[PDB]
């Protein structure tokens, strides 16, 4: 069926936060003008990943009911979703927001930034599988909100309070898949199936760190 006026208010409020968030021009111009080397390619990724942490906190702050949660759970939800939310945002940027040369130049930069092949190949297989879904900005905004408000995270004291905030967002997303994709009735299960693929990046990222920026060090280690 169709979204209720209550769900429309909830979607508009999420989009108000998500749509304002953009990659700065100084970083975008750096992808095309900076020198190509393993050290410089790694530096651009640090600047990008740092910017995402400020973007994540700003989006999470506006999520209805997040500010009413226990302070320790607020930190655990941010730390637990930092990696997943970044790759989901990376998938959106790598499959959409690119003029003519940025797409291929950034791929070359990621591949030649000193990150091992065992971590590189799953990234691009995830970007390609997500790109086949042909998701809209609404679906990206909701999936990010669902990734952040995950009650299954480690060291969460009040998991039920997280479940209460997540459930309205899964319901809006379920209704969106039925409306914009009625010919593919299994589209919703496919979106959630890509989340188990997103979760495998957590162990890959931890391994990559054992082999920055004050903000990145706090959210990671």
């Amino acid at each position: 069926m169709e979204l209720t006026p209550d769900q429309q208010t909830l979607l508009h409020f999420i989009m108000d936060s998500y749509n304002k968030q953009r990659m700065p021009q100084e970083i975008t111009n750096k992808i095309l003008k900076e020198a190509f080397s393993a050290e410089e390619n790694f530096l651009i990724l640090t600047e990008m990943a740092t910017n995402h942490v400020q973007v994540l906190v700003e989006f999470t702050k506006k999520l209805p009911g997040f500010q009413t949660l226990d302070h320790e759970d607020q930190i655990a939800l941010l730390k637990g979703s930092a990696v997943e939310a970044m790759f989901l945002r990376s998938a959106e940027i790598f499959n959409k927001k690119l003029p003519s040369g940025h797409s291929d130049l950034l791929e070359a930069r990621i591949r030649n930034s000193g990150i091992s092949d065992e971590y590189i190949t799953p990234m691009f297989s995830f970007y390609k599988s997500i790109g086949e879904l042909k998701m809209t900005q609404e679906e990206y905004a909701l999936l990010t909100a669902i990734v952040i408000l995950s009650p299954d995270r480690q060291y969460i004291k009040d998991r039920e309070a997280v479940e209460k905030l997540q459930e309205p967002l899964l319901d809006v997303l379920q209704k969106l898949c039925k409306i914009h994709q009625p010919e593919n009735p299994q589209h919703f299960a496919c979106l959630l199936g890509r989340l188990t693929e997103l979760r495998t990046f957590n162990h890959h990222h931890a391994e990559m760190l054992m082999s920055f920026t004050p903000l990145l060090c706090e959210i990671w280690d």
Binding site: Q54, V57, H71, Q74, I75, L78, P214, L215, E218, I219
Partner: peptide
């Protein structure tokens, strides 16, 4: 620290 600042501002 930096997370709490960004969270509470």
């Amino acid at each position: 620290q930096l997370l709490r600042y960004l969270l509470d501002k």
